């Protein structure tokens, strides 16, 4: 796809705001462009092979990505579940230099990785900063949109190569154990969905509103990097369960956050009943967006209407009634759910 | 995220024949706060009518609570107006004894 | 009259394109699709998208030393600009028509400069020992598609005035609000603080003393320490009841010490005349003014400038800003909102037809 | 039951007047007691409630100061966040702050939580495990590091397990006349024939507080959580609240159709019937 | 205060010294920054203290072996010693450096020294040796040189001292702490051999500090726990409570040495339940939080037995369960949800607390299933391995199992890498059973156990 991405370098230190200065990264004779600042143009060397690859199949003439980088230093997990990961009072010594939280939110897949970039831009060749991407979290559906009352498989690949250092910490040759954590953030609801710890065993935080992630390393070689999967089965999507999605892969020292939202769709059924017509809805979600309109068939209906109280049903779908006073009288509902045409009424 | 508002025009108490009443058109879950609700008696706009603080809620939505008194009659068909940022067309809805 | 401009296709003959770069913009005599007046509103116009410009008139050489020196144009923005500008720059004799590049050498830049929401400001650059200085005031400019005036008044006391569509927009000193000799006053760097200046003053005891009863031992036995019956002290020694930190124990003996007492208030250096501190009175001073250009990046063309003035005499370029710009805007405004509602009638006509199509295949 | 104290935040911004509106709102359960309104001259914490009135004009100076310096930070934030997500300034932009915390009916703490969101969407919370925040920009993910790193998350912990509990059992104690008290509903249930083959029966928790209710329609003993329909609870306004519990029946069929109606104040669940 | 020790001066200023290497991005070492402050500021001219910002000198990290961040390591003289193993507080750094500080062993020149040594919180070995260039004292000087990181030496040569003991050579005495004086055992153990040898003293230290009941709470750490223990948990504040914890440490002492006479091996501790919280939960114990003392046992093997017993005053529950673990019939305490009496169903609900009865049966091949909840994979196999449950209900010699493997700890060879993993342990090779890592299909299931299990499987 794209070879340069262009992108945002947001800026951390407090005094100075969160100001936005330029500078792209560079998948895969790099091109040159001395308008960007040389600290943040780093031309992404990735040995996962996940990245790259996501984005050479990624769709051509598709609008910019909207990636955003920063500065973070590695803090610990400040969960307790995931303590377990981090149980010693030392940071490694692997952690050296600096790192960048890359989240590229394209409208077809989110992404967050991790680049610990090199001391200083090339002088010889171009202005690159050469980096290195430890850890990838791709989600190949940001949006999913579920209809009421099924399942929804919200992906979750991850992609991790162990920080190249001169001390090799190889005490368990092959792949460290992690920590997934899926949270919906609702409108101030903040619930934790699952926590997971594959390969280390502890007393987990349970389960809640019967979800389960597939969460495995799909290879178990000794040192090649690992492409972890952490899928979120969430069955029977109830409206309580709409909001975004974001999910964690917790490593030591090191976060991988991606969010999704996950938005529910429930087409409803319309009805006209004998004088003043009522057009009442029957199920359907989410409340807002509805568009009553009439039509005499055909032309605009004369005559004055009004709306009826959303009547919600313990479940979560909701029903209203529009009440018109004036061939054929039609009402048609206009949902985004549904064919945008509009799935109308008529009584003749 | 322009949430639209949820009318629910109802009154303190059970409508009767010739007694005093607070049509309390309860407007919520909207966002932002710009908004204006008007009550209707019989199509035209009533003067007198209290509004009560932009309060919050938990869910990042206000919700106002603009009460006028009002003695319940079969005459007149009293009607909440609302007009918002993100509805097109300000929304009217009918007090309804039964709902 | 250093310089008059109504364009009322002669232009070409006083206006002269530059040669430097092979992409150059090609400027077009027109009023635009809305005006207050077909003729009176005529002027140059940028016809080409994410293109360079370059085009300069020479006029009669002049010098600003002793005198005041005012410019006055007009710039309309009726394409609804996202990246450009509509500056203009003063430049000596010695600048070539023919070989002006994108920063040629010139003597003071006035008029807007708009690329994104973030940079909506005037961009009013000087000249002055060989660097080009910008004003550290944020003068916004209009962004609207309507003409806007923009007019520049220098006095030879340095001083300055910039006035937008006839009304005053920002006036000043040019020695005060510009990096000439930005050394003015200096703090001492000798000056400390001395230790007897407190900051966070703070006084022990002010109406209040030891207590002498918070002085409580830190751990008093338990009450309720009950020994129990089958504990024998021959075998453990000696039995005692257990102690626990009692709950009247507090921070020792603190005498209210409270804050802000005989508080002389943060101490700071005190400042001194800067001995670096030059100022010039001939800053505003040049020694001539030979061309005026316009050498602009513009993504969307449709950038149009008209009424161009350059003079001595404040109250004669703004009478005639007055009678070009009040003129035209009012006929302007009302058309403009004549051509909208036409706009908005053929997009209701367009989203009718468009809602009918989809109830048709909705039908099928 | 279980009780709540939360204090809100508004900044609102208003192109065209300067500085943007500032509205502090405090509520002990659903009733505000203080609210700090910036477009009112009065410009302090007015009270609005008798468990708070009995304060001395030193501790309103001190809550006055406190909402001061919030609101000063507050435009700060507002104006670098709009900066930052790149949108127009003519347009109007909320920023929502809020930060409580929920004891049980013994008393003790039983949840606490500090949110913020910008235009209505959740900007950075911090989780009910009092440990760790919730981000869902990067914005937010920027604050996040920045509190982690002066660990002012056990600043919080110390706020929402102490000062904050604590002033709750005082206006709890102080103000027990009005706020701890529980009224149960005078329940109404109505008929009505919408044709000749349906009708709908509609039960009214009318007048009853708190709004923690449910009412629940039996069918032959079977909950049908499905076809019920149901408003949210809504204020009647003078402090109660109301709601209104609906299902649609088979013509003359009302024999076994039960609504459930649980609350606090009651002494055991009501059953009703036609 | 302290100075920074960067590479180019670091051999040059590091010729005791304490240096800790430390990394700015990390929260540890900003953690104990102002305690590491504090901590220099209180051992000045004792022990110099100094900071290394590892991130710019590589060549220091690298030449020391410093992986980690904080390291705090000691440099006695310009020279490596072992690594600072303790609290990183200022409190515990500034107790270790005075540690550090005194010599190997202590010359105690007055008797007035002589009881303040010998009345500290902790063992105390002392050697009296009135001949300065005697074998004995250097050896002993050796010996505390050597074992210096785990006991108190003290060395003097008061004409009175040595008289009122040993007064024959090699005086070497143990003072157990003061706040531990007991009955049965003597508070001063006498060194008794031919000749003093540093081995043969670290030996009879070893062996005679810790007595019967000591009060090991985070120090000792190691030099108990290791061996078949006995740790007793309750509130143990010396200085607040002394009489209870004497109390309670008397009765366990008193059963510990019932036992002891009865001739068996078996060490025994007291803790403090506040110090030790986090081992609580190893044992599964939680917070118990009463005066009453928590019992536990740890062998050398690892295995670990808990009481459910209430430990009585009168000590029969102490001794009860002292004879039950010297028989051996008490089942190793794992982490195990409570079973259900109603194991009924297709699939056997099996539990790490029957593991053993149900999975370990000798007369039948078992096929057990190892499930998390959260698992999706195991969430997708469990009607097929249900149905297939309900299918061969009707072999007796063959049952299917599964056990949750997160909330109950997986005994026996049985491993699980990767959640669902399958096994299969025929009826007599209950110590060899077989990975089944084929397929995932119930008919592959039926198919498998066709061909492994003797019994022919049913529909
Ligand atoms: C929110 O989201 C919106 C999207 O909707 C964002 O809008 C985008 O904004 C970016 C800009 O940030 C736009 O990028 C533009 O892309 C064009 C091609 O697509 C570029 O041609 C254009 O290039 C300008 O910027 C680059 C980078 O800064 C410069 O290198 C380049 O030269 C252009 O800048 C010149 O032109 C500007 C406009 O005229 C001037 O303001 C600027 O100063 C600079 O001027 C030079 O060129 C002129 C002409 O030759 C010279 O005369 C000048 O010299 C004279 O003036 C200087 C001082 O200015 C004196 O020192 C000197 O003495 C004088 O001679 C200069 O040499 C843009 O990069 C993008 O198109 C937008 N998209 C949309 C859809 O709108 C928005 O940015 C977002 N908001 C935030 C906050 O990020
Ligand atoms: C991460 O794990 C999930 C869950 O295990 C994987 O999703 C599902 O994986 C199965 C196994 O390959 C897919 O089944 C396949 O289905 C196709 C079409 O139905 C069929 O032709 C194949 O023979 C096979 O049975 C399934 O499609 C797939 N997706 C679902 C269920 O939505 C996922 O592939 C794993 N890897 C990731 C996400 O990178």
Redesign the interface.
């Known amino acids: 796809g794209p070879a340069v991405i262009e992108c945002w370098f947001?800026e951390?230190a407090?005094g100075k705001?969160?100001?936005?200065r330029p500078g792209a990264l560079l998948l895969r004779e790099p091109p040159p462009r001395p308008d960007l600042d040389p600290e943040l143009y780093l031309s992404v060397h990735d040995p996962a092979g996940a990245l790259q690859a996501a984005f050479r199949r990624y769709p051509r003439g598709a609008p910019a990505p909207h990636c955003?980088m920063?500065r973070?230093?590695?803090?610990?997990?400040?969960?307790?579940w995931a303590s377990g990961l981090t149980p010693?009072?030392?940071?490694?010594?692997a952690?050296?230099g600096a790192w960048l939280?890359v989240?590229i939110s394209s409208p077809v897949l989110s992404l967050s990785s991790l680049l610990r970039p090199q001391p200083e831009p090339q002088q010889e060749p171009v202005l690159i900063t050469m980096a290195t991407v430890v850890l990838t979290v791709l989600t190949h559906t940001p949006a999913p949109r579920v209809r009421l009352g099924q399942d929804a498989l919200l992906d979750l690949s991850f992609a991790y190569m162990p920080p190249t250092s001169?001390?090799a910490?190889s005490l368990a040759p092959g792949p460290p154990p992690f920590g997934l954590e899926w949270?919906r953030?609702?409108?101030?609801k903040?619930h934790?969905l699952?926590?997971?710890t594959?390969?280390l065993?502890?007393?987990?935080p349970?389960?809640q509103e019967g979800?389960?992630?597939?969460?495995?390393?799909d290879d178990?070689e000794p040192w090649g990097p690992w492409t972890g999967n952490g899928?979120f089965?969430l069955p029977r999507v109830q409206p309580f369960q709409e909001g975004?999605y974001?999910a964690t892969i917790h490593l030591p020292y090191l976060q991988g956050?991606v969010?999704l939202e996950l938005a529910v769709y429930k087409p409803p059924k319309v009805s006209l009943?004998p004088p003043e017509l009522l057009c009442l809805v029957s199920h359907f979600y989410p409340?807002?967006g509805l568009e009553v309109e009439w039509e005499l068939r055909?032309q605009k209906a004369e005559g004055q209407r009004?709306?009826?109280?959303?009547?919600?049903?313990?479940?979560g779908s909701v029903?209203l009634s529009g009440?018109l006073q004036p061939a054929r009288y039609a009402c048609?509902i206009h949902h985004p759910s549904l064919?945008?045409?509009?799935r109308?009424a008529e009584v003749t | 995220i322009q949430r639209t508002p949820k009318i629910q025009v109802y009154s303190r108490h059970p409508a009767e024949n010739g007694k005093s009443n607070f049509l309390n058109c309860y407007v919520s879950g909207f966002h932002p706060s710009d908004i204006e609700v008007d009550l209707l008696k019989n199509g035209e706009r009533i003067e007198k009518v209290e509004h009560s603080d932009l309060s919050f809620s938990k869910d990042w939505s206000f919700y106002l609570l603009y009460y006028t008194e009002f003695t319940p009659t079969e005459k007149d068909e009293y009607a909440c107006r609302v007009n918002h940022v993100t509805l097109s067309q300000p929304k009217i809805v009918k007090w309804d004894r039964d709902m | 009259v250093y310089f008059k401009e109504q364009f009322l296709d002669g232009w070409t003959s006083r206006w002269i394109e530059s040669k430097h770069k092979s992409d150059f913009g090609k400027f077009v005599l027109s009023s635009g699709k809305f005006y207050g007046d077909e003729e009176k509103d005529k002027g140059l116009q940028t016809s080409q998208d994410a293109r360079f410009y370059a085009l300069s008139a020479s006029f009669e050489p002049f010098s600003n030393k002793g005198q005041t020196l005012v410019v006055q144009f007009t710039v309309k923005h009726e394409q609804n600009i996202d990246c450009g500008g509509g500056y203009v720059k003063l430049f000596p004799n010695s600048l070539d028509q023919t070989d002006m590049h994108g920063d040629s050498e010139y003597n003071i830049m006035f008029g807007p400069d708009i690329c994104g929401p973030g940079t909506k400001k005037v961009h009013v650059i000087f000249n002055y020992k060989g660097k080009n200085v910008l004003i550290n005031k944020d003068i916004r400019c209009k962004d609207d598609e309507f003409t806007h005036l923009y007019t520049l008044i220098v006095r030879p006391d340095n001083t300055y005035e910039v006035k937008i569509d006839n009304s005053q927009v920002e006036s000043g000193s040019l020695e005060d609000d510009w990096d000439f000799l930005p050394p003015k006053k200096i703090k001492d760097p000798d000056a400390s603080k001395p230790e007897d200046w407190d900051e966070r003053a703070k006084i022990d005891d002010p109406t209040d003393s030891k207590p002498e009863d918070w002085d409580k031992p830190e751990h008093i036995p338990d009450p309720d320490a009950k020994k129990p019956e089958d504990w024998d002290e021959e075998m453990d020694g000696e039995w005692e009841p257990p102690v626990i930190q009692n709950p009247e124990y507090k921070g020792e003996w603190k005498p209210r010490q409270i804050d802000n007492p005989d508080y002389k208030g943060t101490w700071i250096h005190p400042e001194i005349d800067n001995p670096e501190y030059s100022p010039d009175p001939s800053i505003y001073a040049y020694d001539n003014f030979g061309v005026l250009g316009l050498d602009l990046w513009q993504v969307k063309s449709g950038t149009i400038f008209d009424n161009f003035l350059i003079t001595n005499d404040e109250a004669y370029a703004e009478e005639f800003g007055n009678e070009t710009w009040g003129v035209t805007k009012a006929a302007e405004k009302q058309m403009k909102d004549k051509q909208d509602e036409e706009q908005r009638l053929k997009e209701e006509e367009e989203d009718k037809k468009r809602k009918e199509e989809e109830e048709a295949e909705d039908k099928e | 039951g279980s009780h709540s104290m939360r204090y809100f935040f508004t900044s609102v911004s208003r192109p065209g007047r300067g500085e943007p509106r500032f509205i502090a709102v405090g509520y002990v359960d659903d009733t505000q007691f203080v609210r700090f309104d910036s477009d009112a001259a009065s410009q302090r914490m007015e009270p609005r409630a008798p468990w708070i009135e009995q304060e001395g004009p030193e501790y309103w100076d001190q809550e006055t100061r406190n909402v001061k310096a919030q609101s000063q930070t507050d435009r700060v934030d507002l104006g670098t966040l709009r900066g930052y997500y790149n949108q127009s300034e003519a347009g109007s932009h909320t920023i929502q702050i809020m930060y409580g915390c929920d004891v049980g009916s013994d008393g003790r703490f039983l949840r606490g939580y500090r949110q913020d969101a910008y235009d209505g969407k959740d900007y950075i919370a911090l989780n009910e495990d009092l440990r760790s925040w919730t981000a869902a920009d990067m914005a937010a993910q920027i604050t996040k590091r920045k509190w982690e790193a002066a660990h002012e998350a056990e600043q919080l912990r110390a706020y929402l397990d102490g000062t904050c509990v604590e002033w709750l059992r005082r206006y709890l104690e102080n103000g027990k006349e009005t706020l701890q008290r529980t009224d149960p509903p005078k329940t109404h249930m109505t008929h009505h024939p919408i044709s000749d083959h349906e009708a709908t029966l509609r039960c009214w928790a009318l007048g009853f507080y708190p709004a923690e209710i449910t009412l629940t329609w039996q069918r032959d003993g079977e909950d049908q959580t499905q076809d019920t329909e149901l408003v949210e609870t809504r204020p009647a306004g003078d402090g109660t609240f109301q709601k209104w519990a609906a299902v649609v029946v088979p013509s003359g069929e009302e024999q076994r159709y039960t609504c459930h109606v649980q609350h606090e104040g009651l002494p055991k669940p009501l059953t009703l019937r036609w | 205060d302290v100075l920074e020790l960067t590479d180019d001066n670091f051999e040059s200023r590091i010729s005791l010294m304490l240096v800790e290497f430390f990394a700015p991005w990390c929260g540890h070492c900003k953690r104990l920054a102002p305690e590491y402050e504090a901590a220099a500021t209180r051992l000045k001219g004792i022990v110099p203290l100094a900071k290394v910002d590892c991130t710019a000198n590589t060549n220091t990290c690298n030449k020391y072996g410093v992986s980690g961040y904080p390291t705090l390591k000691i440099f006695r003289d310009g020279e490596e010693a072992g690594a600072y193993d303790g609290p990183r507080t200022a409190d515990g750094i500034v107790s270790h450096l005075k540690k550090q500080a005194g010599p190997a062993s202590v010359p105690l020149r007055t008797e007035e020294e002589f009881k303040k040594f010998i009345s500290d919180k902790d063992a105390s070995i002392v050697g009296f040796f009135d001949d300065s260039f005697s074998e004995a004292h250097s050896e002993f000087l050796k010996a505390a040189s050597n074992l210096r990181d785990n006991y108190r030496f003290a060395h003097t040569n008061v004409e009175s001292l040595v008289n009122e003991y040993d007064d024959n050579g090699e005086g070497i005495i143990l003072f157990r702490p003061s706040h531990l004086t007991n009955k049965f055992e003597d508070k001063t153990v006498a060194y008794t051999e031919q000749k003093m040898t540093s081995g043969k003293i670290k030996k009879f230290i070893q062996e005679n500090i810790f007595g019967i009941c000591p009060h090991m709470t985070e120090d000792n750490k190691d030099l108990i726990q290791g061996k078949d223990l006995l740790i007793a948990y309750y509130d143990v504040d010396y200085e607040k409570n002394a009489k209870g914890s004497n109390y309670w440490r008397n009765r366990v002492m008193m059963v510990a040495k019932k036992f002891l006479d009865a001739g068996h091996k078996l060490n025994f501790a007291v803790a403090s339940r506040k110090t030790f919280s986090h081992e609580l939960s190893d044992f599964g114990l939680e917070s118990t939080a009463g005066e009453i003392p928590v019992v536990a046992i740890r062998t050398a093997k690892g295995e670990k037995f808990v009481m459910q017993e209430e430990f009585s005053r009168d000590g029969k529950a102490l001794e009860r369960f002292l004879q039950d673990y010297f028989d051996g019939n008490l089942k190793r305490y794992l982490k195990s949800e409570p079973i259900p009496e109603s194991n009924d169903g297709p699939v056997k609900v099996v539990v790490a607390e029957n593991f053993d009865e149900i999975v370990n049966n000798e007369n039948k091949d078992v096929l057990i299933e190892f499930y998390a909840p959260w698992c999706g994979h195991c969430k997708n196999l469990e009607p097929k391995y249900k149905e297939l449950g309900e299918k061969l209900s009707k072999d007796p010699n063959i049952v299917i199992a599964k056990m949750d493997a997160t909330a109950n700890d997986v005994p026996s060879p049985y491993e699980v890498r990767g959640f669902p993993t399958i096994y299969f342990s025929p009826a007599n090779k209950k110590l060899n059973p077989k990975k089944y890592e084929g397929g995932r299909e119930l008919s592959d299931f039926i198919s498998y156990l066709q061909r492994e299990a003797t019994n022919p499987p049913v529909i």
């Open positions: 947001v951390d407090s705001g969160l100001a936005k955003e920063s973070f230093v590695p803090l610990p997990a400040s969960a307790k010693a009072q030392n940071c490694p010594r952690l050296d939280m989240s001169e001390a910490s949270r953030q609702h409108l101030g903040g934790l699952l926590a997971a594959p390969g065993n502890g007393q987990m349970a389960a979800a389960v992630a597939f969460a495995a390393w178990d899928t089965w975004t974001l956050q969010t009943m409340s807002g055909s009004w709306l009826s109280a959303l009547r919600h049903h313990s479940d029903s009440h048609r064919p945008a045409s509009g109308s």
